[PDB]
Amino acid sequence: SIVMTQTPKFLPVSAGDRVTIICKASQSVSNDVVWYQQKPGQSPKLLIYYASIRYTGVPDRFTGSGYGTDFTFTISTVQVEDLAVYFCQQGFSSPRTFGGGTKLEINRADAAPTVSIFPPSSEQLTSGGASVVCFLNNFYPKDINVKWKIDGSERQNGVLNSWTDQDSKDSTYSMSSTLTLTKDEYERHNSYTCEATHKTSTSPIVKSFNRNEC
Amino acid sequence: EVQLQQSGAELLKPGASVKLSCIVSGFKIKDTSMHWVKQRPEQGLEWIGRIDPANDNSEYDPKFQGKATITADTSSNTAYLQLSSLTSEDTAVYYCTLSHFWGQGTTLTVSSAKTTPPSVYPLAPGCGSSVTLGCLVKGYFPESVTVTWNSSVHTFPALLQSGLYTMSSSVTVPSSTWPSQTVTCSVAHPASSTTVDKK
Amino acid sequence: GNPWTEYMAKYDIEEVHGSGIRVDLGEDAEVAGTQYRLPSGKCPVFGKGIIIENSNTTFLTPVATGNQYLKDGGFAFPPTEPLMSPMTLDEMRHFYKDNKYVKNLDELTLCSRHAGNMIPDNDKNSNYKYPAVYDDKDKKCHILYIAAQENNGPRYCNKDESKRNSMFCFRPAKDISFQNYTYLSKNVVDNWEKVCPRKNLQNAKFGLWVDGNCEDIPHVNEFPAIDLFECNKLVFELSASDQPEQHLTDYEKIKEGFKNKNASMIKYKSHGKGYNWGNYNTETQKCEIFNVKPTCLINNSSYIATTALSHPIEVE
């Protein structure tokens, strides 16, 4: 098996800058390398084949070059819509191994999250469980910390965080933090808070609600 | 007109075997190799193998010898991938290709967990120029929940909350549009054939 | 006796091509319970295309689909995905890369084999294969959805600016703009390079072998032609044609090679016989056209020997 070593694994780039992706073959694969684009949720689409030939329909910003072992894929000026994972594949001998892939990230100006905390609904509350969900929406960069507090004291246990992939329009991230309790342990406490620590503010963005308030 | 049509999402128990299909329409398969490619959740593409439909010669990556069996039918212009002795590592999207043209993929879930419909929990403010609403989609299986509101939508990908899945979805609207107007989330779960709307 | 036998084999057009040239519709094939006429000639026709009359839209343009009107489309396969036409040489070689036979085919046979891989109207039991046009300039294979080649009638077609959805007036031709096109039936042979005419023969005049000598073709029709291209054009215009009421009815459409009426089904043979050969006198600018297969060359320096199948320009 020929190993296709694809670097880098992750590539942050700003709109309009050069993307260079490299793929090294462990054995000589001649000119038989293809480059694929996989946009989120979609099948891979052929951009470049025989190392350097642009497929029909593929924009001029996409190029490849190389022969033997060293192959280069380039997006000369990235556009926001180029956000994707890119994969080399060798086709020269079987198995026809793929490179590990390169995930693009579109750099943008830093954005603070908009945070909304939600109480457990009566539908869930009268079933046995109690989920307190907290949205941290449209922020950048992706690095965000959330600390949950019950009655003032930090809870780390029973918390599930889910990040979105980069939004295709505004290039921001969003994430949901859900603190799940039982119905008995939830009615055993009052002040439920989620605190967003992001590099856009010195102090966290605290969003609270007292179960007593309603 | 050429079309690729891959069989539907599969959920099977470990130790089972599945046969996935790839129906090509408008094109004769005989001259073109049918490849199968595996992609595990959030992971890269792995070439499984390919078949020469003209001569029934199929080849594989040594990782898939014993696991995958690729066949083709030039009569019905269909390619098949049979997977045996199913395992959680077999959980993936499986793409068929008509040569360098890819199918839309077939999602295989290998799990001892049973098909379970979700319960839908509304996420309201309770007790700014804008307001965010939501829907909690807890305790379902397997993946594929479609929550639609009737652009400013966020879908937060599911986490496996011990055997079952949990996702959530948010919408932000002008605070003058709610609560004066009925905002509704429709949670679709094809696997269990359930679609329930929370007000 | 005759030193020209093997040399002259490719000019037995009835034998090596075996169908119309001008209009090639030498076979019938069933699609969804109806016989349709279709190209079946074994040789490529170099420099052939279809002129659409009173129109700026060229025949390699995809046929009209969806919201598009008839006259706004041409003859070629519409752009669906995965995209089968137009397909470039390198794309075709990549597409068929694991097929040692097909991947190594010359570009013309490759294009013909690719087109022949399309299934017509979801009829998998159908022998009907679409023809194609290879453009050597851009190295593209264009599959033709419309296998009709001539529709010319002061009743069979509408010629108007306003009438956008009425039927094409069209004819086959060797236009200068088609010089790099080759018209390819499903039947185009593997070895067309060995067995089919391509380049015009300099210093050569077609004759008949009679009693150990190469004699002039006994019956020739002579026309002015300023250059070789013009002579090839004229010979093509007179060549074997598989072309055939008061109106363009469904049956008359079938006879002209039509198969579909707006994504729905519509519900003779020369065998290579015709005025397929010309002797071009470069000095007097005369095109000497005839209809018997030539069996030798007269070596005359004023002459170029041409064929309806031959490239309009290329000489050897």
XYZ file of C-alpha atoms in Angstrom:
729
model
C 0.000 0.000 0.000
C 1.238 3.449 -1.012
C 0.851 5.979 1.784
C -0.265 9.449 0.690
C 0.906 11.851 3.393
C -1.301 14.951 3.130
C -0.242 18.160 4.912
C -1.402 20.324 6.522
C -4.356 18.655 8.320
C -5.949 21.999 9.161
C -5.485 25.219 7.242
C -6.801 28.565 8.500
C -6.903 31.043 5.582
C -8.454 34.462 4.969
C -10.652 35.204 1.946
C -8.350 36.002 -0.967
C -5.162 34.348 0.244
C -3.286 31.361 -1.187
C -4.085 27.820 -0.050
C -1.222 25.378 -0.643
C -1.826 21.714 0.178
C 0.928 19.110 -0.180
C 0.599 15.373 -0.616
C 3.644 13.056 -0.576
C 3.539 9.539 -2.046
C 5.573 6.865 -0.234
C 6.247 5.276 -3.656
C 6.328 6.857 -7.139
C 2.789 7.317 -8.477
C 3.752 8.962 -11.801
C 1.092 11.596 -12.645
C -1.886 9.659 -11.276
C -3.086 11.898 -8.459
C -6.538 13.426 -8.129
C -7.709 16.192 -5.807
C -11.227 16.186 -4.343
C -13.336 18.821 -2.669
C -15.790 17.774 0.011
C -18.098 20.564 1.142
C -19.917 19.844 4.430
C -22.702 17.262 3.989
C -21.797 16.602 0.339
C -20.044 13.928 -1.713
C -16.445 14.598 -2.823
C -16.153 16.386 -6.187
C -13.194 15.970 -8.557
C -11.251 19.213 -9.000
C -7.915 18.026 -10.415
C -6.934 14.731 -12.066
C -3.643 13.423 -13.526
C -1.902 15.686 -10.964
C -2.490 18.905 -12.923
C -5.637 18.785 -15.102
C -8.586 20.936 -14.034
C -11.931 19.124 -14.510
C -14.662 20.790 -16.585
C -16.598 23.328 -14.496
C -13.772 23.717 -11.975
C -12.828 27.425 -11.396
C -9.406 28.788 -12.442
C -8.440 29.409 -8.801
C -8.002 25.634 -8.394
C -4.735 24.134 -9.688
C -2.513 21.118 -9.035
C 1.063 20.230 -10.025
C 3.581 17.447 -9.464
C 5.033 14.217 -10.798
C 6.437 11.143 -9.025
C 6.111 11.541 -5.253
C 5.496 15.256 -4.529
C 2.112 16.785 -5.345
C 0.756 20.272 -4.741
C -2.848 21.454 -4.709
C -3.397 25.216 -4.752
C -6.339 27.556 -4.344
C -4.704 30.787 -5.556
C -7.311 33.079 -3.953
C -9.689 31.329 -1.515
C -13.328 32.334 -1.554
C -15.572 31.838 1.502
C -17.523 29.191 -0.472
C -14.331 27.094 -0.874
C -14.748 26.060 2.766
C -14.269 22.305 2.571
C -12.050 19.322 3.291
C -9.660 18.582 0.420
C -8.280 15.072 -0.260
C -5.545 13.822 -2.614
C -5.839 10.279 -3.916
C -3.299 8.200 -5.814
C -4.699 6.067 -8.618
C -1.418 4.645 -9.900
C -1.550 1.256 -8.135
C -4.029 -0.472 -5.810
C -5.037 0.045 -3.063
C -5.894 3.543 -4.327
C -5.131 5.351 -1.130
C -6.441 8.741 -0.110
C -4.419 11.393 1.688
C -5.602 12.196 5.219
C -7.386 15.372 4.091
C -7.013 19.089 4.787
C -9.751 20.993 6.572
C -10.071 24.661 5.620
C -11.029 27.339 8.079
C -12.015 30.784 6.864
C -10.409 33.462 9.048
C -12.691 36.305 10.000
C -12.813 39.206 12.443
C -13.420 38.075 16.034
C -17.069 38.002 17.120
C -18.599 37.720 20.591
C -21.217 34.989 21.133
C -24.907 35.751 21.727
C -25.919 33.660 24.721
C -29.413 32.430 25.563
C -30.158 30.160 28.520
C -33.358 28.096 28.502
C -35.194 26.447 31.419
C -36.348 22.788 31.264
C -39.779 22.533 29.604
C -42.865 21.089 31.326
C -42.825 18.364 28.641
C -39.433 17.097 29.884
C -39.848 18.235 33.499
C -42.836 15.919 34.062
C -41.085 12.890 32.526
C -38.124 12.404 34.886
C -35.364 14.578 33.409
C -34.437 18.267 33.312
C -32.192 19.746 30.616
C -30.929 23.312 30.884
C -29.746 24.352 27.411
C -27.472 27.322 26.693
C -26.720 28.601 23.171
C -23.449 30.391 22.435
C -24.222 31.672 18.944
C -22.259 33.262 16.061
C -18.792 33.632 17.641
C -15.191 33.590 16.337
C -12.636 32.112 16.929
C -13.836 28.594 17.809
C -12.023 28.498 21.164
C -14.696 29.089 23.794
C -15.025 28.055 27.433
C -18.328 27.466 29.222
C -18.647 27.076 32.995
C -22.005 26.031 34.427
C -22.940 27.242 37.907
C -25.689 25.909 40.171
C -26.476 28.073 43.237
C -23.101 29.773 42.642
C -20.959 26.626 42.666
C -19.419 25.434 39.393
C -20.703 22.171 37.946
C -18.554 20.282 35.440
C -20.469 16.987 35.667
C -23.400 16.148 33.352
C -22.600 18.820 30.744
C -22.708 18.168 26.975
C -21.163 20.654 24.506
C -21.897 20.604 20.757
C -20.171 22.958 18.303
C -21.495 23.679 14.837
C -19.175 23.583 11.843
C -18.274 27.021 10.459
C -21.348 28.837 9.137
C -21.216 29.063 5.323
C -22.428 32.693 5.268
C -20.778 34.547 8.185
C -17.930 32.063 8.954
C -18.720 32.145 12.683
C -19.187 29.188 15.019
C -22.074 28.393 17.330
C -22.265 25.930 20.213
C -24.870 24.482 22.580
C -24.128 23.630 26.192
C -26.698 21.398 27.877
C -26.638 20.655 31.594
C -28.848 17.608 32.156
C -30.179 16.843 35.636
C -32.869 14.564 37.049
C -36.236 16.172 37.899
C -35.474 15.667 41.622
C -31.963 17.213 41.627
C -33.153 20.170 39.519
C -35.940 21.159 41.938
C -33.286 20.781 44.675
C -31.503 23.969 43.492
C -32.319 27.513 42.299
C -29.842 29.711 40.368
C -28.776 28.098 37.067
C -26.108 29.935 35.056
C -23.896 29.399 31.994
C -20.760 31.550 31.624
C -19.154 32.081 28.204
C -15.432 32.847 28.272
C -14.212 33.931 24.846
C -11.250 36.113 23.814
C -13.656 38.946 22.831
C -14.165 40.058 26.463
C -12.108 40.174 29.675
C -15.089 39.069 31.779
C -17.406 36.125 30.915
C -20.869 36.537 29.371
C -23.105 35.317 32.214
C -26.671 34.244 31.444
C -28.707 33.119 34.442
C -32.227 32.263 35.577
C -33.681 31.473 38.990
C -36.210 28.619 39.143
C -37.944 30.750 41.828
C -38.403 33.748 39.493
C -41.352 32.186 37.617
C -29.353 11.301 -18.307
C -26.919 9.622 -15.914
C -27.907 9.226 -12.266
C -26.432 7.364 -9.314
C -28.859 6.057 -6.725
C -27.549 4.536 -3.518
C -29.746 2.436 -1.208
C -31.244 3.889 1.992
C -29.745 4.383 5.444
C -29.195 1.083 7.225
C -29.296 0.236 10.925
C -28.080 -3.247 11.875
C -26.876 -5.079 14.999
C -23.169 -6.008 15.362
C -22.262 -9.381 13.818
C -24.823 -8.882 11.044
C -24.151 -8.383 7.337
C -25.431 -5.743 4.933
C -25.602 -5.471 1.144
C -25.583 -1.894 -0.171
C -26.562 -1.065 -3.744
C -25.618 1.588 -6.270
C -28.050 1.843 -9.214
C -26.705 3.731 -12.223
C -29.358 5.007 -14.644
C -28.844 6.235 -18.228
C -25.364 4.667 -18.463
C -23.789 1.277 -19.260
C -21.538 0.234 -16.375
C -19.510 -2.391 -18.273
C -16.592 -0.094 -19.268
C -16.274 1.801 -15.959
C -14.909 0.607 -12.615
C -17.292 0.878 -9.680
C -15.366 1.968 -6.580
C -16.545 1.936 -2.989
C -15.171 4.432 -0.509
C -15.707 4.535 3.241
C -15.980 7.612 5.419
C -16.428 7.316 9.183
C -18.083 10.212 11.113
C -15.708 13.223 11.024
C -12.909 11.074 9.513
C -11.255 10.920 6.080
C -12.019 8.899 2.960
C -10.750 5.288 2.765
C -10.755 3.383 -0.498
C -12.419 0.023 0.114
C -11.967 -1.423 -3.353
C -13.249 -1.452 -6.927
C -14.807 -3.823 -9.433
C -14.259 -4.210 -13.135
C -17.857 -4.982 -14.154
C -16.754 -6.284 -17.603
C -14.709 -9.080 -16.039
C -15.956 -9.309 -12.405
C -12.440 -8.618 -11.129
C -12.734 -6.808 -7.833
C -9.786 -5.704 -5.711
C -9.535 -4.338 -2.166
C -7.300 -2.702 0.394
C -5.864 -5.562 2.541
C -7.711 -3.925 5.487
C -11.028 -4.928 3.848
C -10.144 -8.467 2.677
C -12.721 -10.588 4.501
C -14.904 -7.600 5.349
C -15.985 -6.134 2.022
C -17.214 -7.937 -1.079
C -17.793 -5.804 -4.179
C -19.978 -7.110 -7.024
C -21.493 -5.565 -10.168
C -24.393 -6.361 -12.466
C -24.057 -5.094 -16.047
C -27.636 -6.250 -16.749
C -29.213 -3.875 -14.215
C -26.204 -1.498 -14.177
C -25.903 -1.837 -10.416
C -22.867 -2.178 -8.139
C -22.994 -3.786 -4.705
C -20.957 -3.677 -1.516
C -21.559 -6.497 0.932
C -20.123 -6.038 4.413
C -19.866 -9.053 6.719
C -19.377 -9.546 10.484
C -20.578 -5.998 11.240
C -18.741 -3.913 13.826
C -18.946 -0.344 15.199
C -15.864 0.458 13.066
C -18.134 -0.306 10.086
C -20.353 2.661 11.043
C -19.754 5.041 8.137
C -21.003 6.686 4.979
C -20.331 4.368 2.057
C -19.877 6.009 -1.326
C -20.130 4.179 -4.606
C -18.440 5.777 -7.568
C -19.108 5.434 -11.276
C -15.400 5.766 -12.010
C -14.557 9.357 -10.849
C -18.230 10.285 -10.304
C -19.456 9.820 -6.736
C -22.834 8.717 -5.396
C -24.538 10.616 -2.580
C -23.497 7.904 -0.086
C -25.331 5.398 2.113
C -25.214 5.856 5.893
C -24.631 2.593 7.763
C -25.199 2.522 11.523
C -23.961 -0.627 13.294
C -25.499 -0.716 16.774
C -27.305 -2.941 19.274
C -29.503 0.087 20.070
C -33.037 -0.025 18.643
C -34.790 2.533 16.425
C -36.243 5.060 18.877
C -38.322 8.163 18.007
C -37.326 11.434 19.706
C -39.348 13.463 22.177
C -39.465 17.175 21.347
C -38.965 19.786 24.069
C -39.655 23.489 23.386
C -36.973 25.944 24.506
C -38.540 29.289 25.416
C -37.043 32.294 27.329
C -39.439 32.194 30.323
C -40.077 34.975 32.864
C -33.044 43.076 23.634
C -34.075 43.786 20.040
C -33.921 40.035 19.279
C -35.023 36.720 20.836
C -33.646 33.187 20.346
C -35.942 30.139 20.461
C -35.131 26.427 20.325
C -36.121 22.764 20.243
C -34.574 19.923 22.234
C -34.487 16.588 20.399
C -33.569 14.006 23.059
C -33.380 10.208 23.280
C -33.636 9.220 19.601
C -31.871 6.628 17.427
C -30.356 6.467 14.854
C -29.037 9.729 13.349
C -31.017 11.821 10.822
C -33.281 14.344 12.521
C -34.580 17.240 10.394
C -35.884 20.195 12.408
C -37.552 22.878 10.255
C -38.989 26.187 11.503
C -42.269 27.672 10.242
C -31.831 31.189 7.569
C -31.199 32.497 11.113
C -31.224 28.823 12.157
C -28.483 26.894 13.944
C -28.488 23.108 13.986
C -26.245 21.711 16.711
C -24.993 18.213 15.715
C -26.128 15.258 17.841
C -24.238 13.794 20.797
C -24.736 10.172 21.834
C -26.331 10.634 25.267
C -25.719 7.021 26.419
C -27.199 4.730 23.745
C -29.528 7.444 22.406
C -28.901 10.751 20.560
C -29.483 14.365 21.622
C -29.465 17.376 19.304
C -30.796 20.941 19.542
C -31.771 23.669 17.090
C -32.030 27.437 17.536
C -33.777 30.228 15.613
C -33.389 33.973 16.220
C -36.265 36.285 15.279
C -37.203 39.949 15.914
C -38.643 40.195 19.445
C -41.705 41.850 17.858
C -42.390 38.705 15.770
C -42.655 36.567 18.940
C -44.678 35.710 21.040
C -47.260 37.605 18.937
C -46.885 35.043 16.108
C -46.784 31.232 16.353
C -43.240 29.912 15.882
C -43.101 26.142 15.350
C -40.354 23.529 15.078
C -41.072 20.402 13.053
C -38.836 17.525 14.119
C -38.583 14.798 11.473
C -37.210 11.338 12.234
C -37.498 9.086 9.121
C -36.063 5.955 10.810
C -38.956 5.712 13.295
C -41.405 7.362 10.838
C -42.225 10.206 13.266
C -42.766 13.927 12.648
C -43.965 15.963 15.647
C -44.485 19.746 15.854
C -43.922 21.675 19.093
C -45.617 25.079 19.455
C -1.396 -7.124 -61.634
C -2.833 -4.086 -59.822
C -0.313 -2.478 -57.413
C -3.090 -0.364 -55.851
C -5.318 -3.064 -54.285
C -4.458 -2.741 -50.565
C -3.790 0.978 -50.990
C -7.243 1.456 -52.571
C -9.230 -0.636 -50.062
C -10.172 2.321 -47.829
C -11.843 4.056 -50.819
C -14.393 1.256 -51.249
C -16.806 3.368 -49.182
C -19.727 0.982 -49.707
C -17.553 -1.692 -48.080
C -15.639 0.242 -45.379
C -18.338 2.742 -44.324
C -21.487 0.901 -45.479
C -24.016 3.684 -44.754
C -24.960 7.263 -45.732
C -22.418 10.068 -45.376
C -24.388 13.258 -46.022
C -27.148 11.714 -43.924
C -26.276 8.516 -42.051
C -29.352 6.616 -40.871
C -28.448 3.121 -42.065
C -29.838 1.153 -39.145
C -33.047 1.025 -37.157
C -33.191 0.290 -33.427
C -36.107 -0.071 -31.074
C -36.579 2.269 -28.129
C -39.646 1.713 -25.908
C -41.568 -0.202 -28.601
C -40.724 1.927 -31.673
C -38.098 1.600 -34.429
C -35.885 4.657 -34.739
C -33.446 5.454 -37.502
C -29.863 6.135 -36.447
C -26.311 6.534 -37.818
C -24.501 3.259 -38.478
C -21.512 4.185 -40.671
C -18.224 2.478 -39.770
C -15.988 5.388 -40.815
C -15.630 8.831 -39.235
C -16.958 11.713 -41.326
C -14.334 14.446 -41.080
C -15.479 18.031 -41.288
C -19.178 17.195 -40.988
C -21.613 19.097 -38.842
C -25.194 20.349 -38.947
C -26.049 23.894 -40.110
C -29.130 25.314 -38.379
C -30.673 27.767 -40.827
C -31.786 31.317 -39.979
C -30.166 30.861 -36.563
C -27.195 31.927 -34.425
C -27.431 28.859 -32.171
C -24.882 26.197 -33.143
C -25.617 22.462 -33.315
C -23.131 21.428 -30.591
C -25.220 23.473 -28.146
C -27.211 21.227 -25.758
C -30.796 20.473 -26.870
C -33.516 22.645 -25.337
C -34.630 21.405 -21.905
C -36.865 22.843 -19.161
C -37.842 26.482 -19.717
C -35.756 26.707 -22.935
C -37.395 26.946 -26.370
C -36.595 24.519 -29.221
C -34.672 27.043 -31.385
C -32.500 28.123 -28.437
C -30.986 24.649 -28.221
C -28.824 22.635 -30.580
C -28.426 18.891 -31.076
C -26.163 17.844 -28.167
C -26.747 16.097 -24.818
C -28.055 18.515 -22.119
C -25.844 19.357 -19.093
C -26.895 16.912 -16.379
C -24.775 15.542 -13.505
C -22.655 13.446 -13.635
C -21.736 15.234 -16.869
C -21.321 12.848 -19.793
C -21.178 15.439 -22.575
C -19.227 17.367 -23.464
C -16.299 15.315 -22.214
C -12.705 16.161 -23.082
C -10.117 13.594 -24.199
C -8.236 13.641 -20.891
C -11.494 13.379 -18.922
C -12.535 10.402 -21.085
C -9.159 8.713 -20.674
C -9.484 9.227 -16.904
C -13.107 8.043 -16.853
C -12.187 4.783 -18.632
C -8.716 4.468 -17.069
C -9.230 0.947 -15.668
C -10.365 -0.404 -19.054
C -7.146 -1.241 -20.956
C -8.975 -1.500 -24.282
C -11.107 1.683 -24.055
C -8.406 3.816 -22.369
C -5.992 3.133 -25.263
C -8.484 3.885 -28.057
C -7.815 6.710 -30.523
C -9.845 9.856 -29.677
C -12.496 9.231 -32.365
C -13.284 5.631 -31.401
C -13.049 6.644 -27.744
C -15.714 9.329 -28.352
C -17.927 6.901 -30.276
C -17.589 4.287 -27.510
C -18.397 6.859 -24.795
C -21.519 8.069 -26.636
C -22.454 4.406 -27.188
C -22.464 3.960 -23.398
C -25.462 6.249 -22.966
C -28.722 4.380 -22.475
C -31.598 5.909 -24.523
C -34.775 6.931 -22.662
C -34.163 4.390 -19.849
C -34.433 1.458 -22.264
C -31.642 -0.919 -21.162
C -32.657 -3.539 -23.771
C -32.130 -1.031 -26.603
C -29.480 -1.341 -29.327
C -29.978 2.362 -30.023
C -26.761 4.304 -29.531
C -26.460 8.061 -29.953
C -23.990 9.491 -32.494
C -21.322 11.964 -31.485
C -19.103 14.767 -32.723
C -15.470 14.972 -31.712
C -13.875 18.424 -31.851
C -10.095 18.070 -32.333
C -9.467 21.743 -31.544
C -10.697 21.680 -27.922
C -10.406 17.846 -27.676
C -14.080 17.431 -26.718
C -16.487 14.628 -27.383
C -20.053 15.907 -27.863
C -22.798 13.275 -27.651
C -25.720 14.101 -29.945
C -29.200 13.769 -28.513
C -30.748 14.538 -31.900
C -29.633 11.955 -34.491
C -31.612 13.719 -37.258
C -29.303 15.379 -39.784
C -31.591 17.069 -42.307
C -34.937 18.778 -41.933
C -35.595 21.068 -44.896
C -39.102 21.989 -45.987
C -41.236 25.011 -46.847
C -43.645 22.998 -44.635
C -41.387 20.722 -42.552
C -39.844 23.590 -40.610
C -40.500 27.161 -39.512
C -38.082 29.991 -40.313
C -38.924 32.952 -38.065
C -37.588 35.255 -35.327
C -40.751 35.294 -33.197
C -41.536 31.564 -33.564
C -39.110 30.357 -30.904
C -40.589 26.922 -30.111
C -41.269 25.767 -33.689
C -39.138 23.194 -35.550
C -35.543 23.694 -36.786
C -34.700 24.005 -40.443
C -31.375 22.199 -40.739
C -28.969 20.448 -43.097
C -25.666 18.535 -42.911
C -22.645 20.404 -44.292
C -18.901 20.738 -44.312
C -18.696 24.343 -43.180
C -15.254 25.901 -42.560
C -16.295 26.211 -38.881
C -16.710 22.392 -38.830
C -13.193 21.673 -40.167
C -12.056 20.129 -36.823
C -15.272 18.184 -36.233
C -15.768 14.532 -36.955
C -19.250 13.025 -37.091
C -19.279 9.636 -35.400
C -21.875 6.889 -35.573
C -22.086 4.187 -32.891
C -20.411 1.856 -35.430
C -17.082 3.680 -35.930
C -14.465 0.965 -36.198
C -11.360 0.407 -34.052
C -9.063 0.443 -37.025
C -10.608 3.324 -39.024
C -7.033 4.658 -39.440
C -6.122 1.602 -41.464
C -9.458 1.063 -43.213
C -11.107 4.485 -43.588
C -10.229 7.546 -45.691
C -8.838 10.574 -43.905
C -6.431 12.748 -45.826
C -6.812 13.788 -49.408
C -4.254 12.344 -51.799
C -1.873 14.805 -53.409
C -0.473 13.986 -56.861
C -3.265 11.443 -57.329
C -6.398 11.108 -59.403
C -8.894 8.272 -58.855
C -9.243 5.940 -61.835
C -10.533 2.502 -62.809
C -8.221 -0.438 -63.371
C -9.007 -1.768 -66.852
C -6.817 -4.303 -68.710
C -3.589 -3.654 -66.786
C -3.924 0.141 -66.916
C -5.401 2.840 -64.692
C -8.065 4.523 -66.783
C -10.080 7.669 -66.089
C -13.407 7.321 -64.317
C -15.803 7.007 -67.309
C -18.590 9.115 -65.789
C -17.718 12.299 -63.940
C -19.816 15.420 -63.157
C -17.659 18.524 -63.236
C -18.164 21.627 -61.072
C -16.056 24.705 -60.300
C -14.235 24.700 -56.954
C -11.697 27.400 -56.039
C -9.814 25.115 -53.657
C -9.727 21.561 -52.291
C -12.064 22.389 -49.386
C -14.782 23.579 -51.787
C -14.478 20.327 -53.799
C -14.758 18.171 -50.662
C -17.858 20.198 -49.695
C -19.477 19.557 -53.103
C -18.644 15.830 -52.979
C -20.100 15.599 -49.472
C -23.265 17.372 -50.747
C -23.729 14.630 -53.357
C -22.629 11.695 -51.221
C -24.608 8.676 -50.013
C -27.647 9.865 -48.116
C -30.057 7.827 -46.010
C -32.564 10.702 -46.066
C -36.125 10.261 -47.407
C -45.694 14.033 -46.836
C -47.432 17.445 -46.816
C -46.494 18.194 -43.193
C -43.833 17.093 -40.700
C -45.900 14.357 -39.052
C -44.656 11.919 -36.377
C -43.913 9.232 -38.986
C -42.028 11.763 -41.169
C -40.011 12.767 -38.088
C -39.042 9.122 -37.449
C -37.890 8.815 -41.090
C -35.680 11.914 -40.679
C -34.055 10.365 -37.589
C -36.039 12.123 -34.856
C -36.763 10.137 -31.678
C -38.205 12.553 -29.104
C -40.852 15.278 -28.887
C -40.000 17.313 -25.746
C -38.828 14.485 -23.422
C -41.329 11.984 -24.874
C -41.143 9.286 -27.566
C -42.254 9.872 -31.154
C -44.650 7.004 -31.959
C -34.191 4.824 -46.625
C -30.771 3.123 -46.892
C -27.969 3.961 -49.316
C -25.499 1.441 -47.791
C -22.631 3.770 -48.783
C -23.776 4.015 -52.431
C -23.560 7.551 -53.851
C -21.351 10.293 -55.285
C -18.664 9.728 -52.667
C -15.503 10.593 -54.597
C -14.031 13.638 -56.288
C -10.960 14.307 -58.384
C -9.898 17.889 -57.790
C -7.951 19.632 -60.510
C -5.930 22.271 -58.647
C -4.893 23.967 -61.888
C -8.263 24.441 -63.556
C -10.170 24.521 -60.243
C -12.580 21.795 -61.275
C -14.139 19.207 -59.042
C -14.780 15.917 -60.883
C -17.393 13.984 -58.880
C -18.323 10.334 -59.496
C -20.230 7.401 -57.920
C -18.285 4.231 -58.753
C -15.624 2.928 -56.397
C -12.118 3.749 -57.700
C -9.657 0.858 -58.004
C -6.405 2.675 -58.827
C -4.580 6.006 -58.941
C -3.575 7.994 -61.953
C -0.487 9.886 -60.827
C -1.219 13.350 -62.191
C 0.411 16.333 -60.498
C -2.601 18.582 -61.131
C -4.822 16.312 -59.048
C -5.856 15.707 -55.474
C -8.128 12.693 -54.861
C -10.863 13.400 -52.305
C -13.715 11.572 -50.584
C -16.972 12.674 -48.904
C -15.519 11.013 -45.752
C -12.150 12.708 -46.042
C -10.947 15.692 -44.126
C -11.890 18.880 -46.023
C -8.351 20.343 -45.817
C -5.702 17.749 -44.902
C -3.461 16.301 -47.591
C -0.761 13.611 -47.683
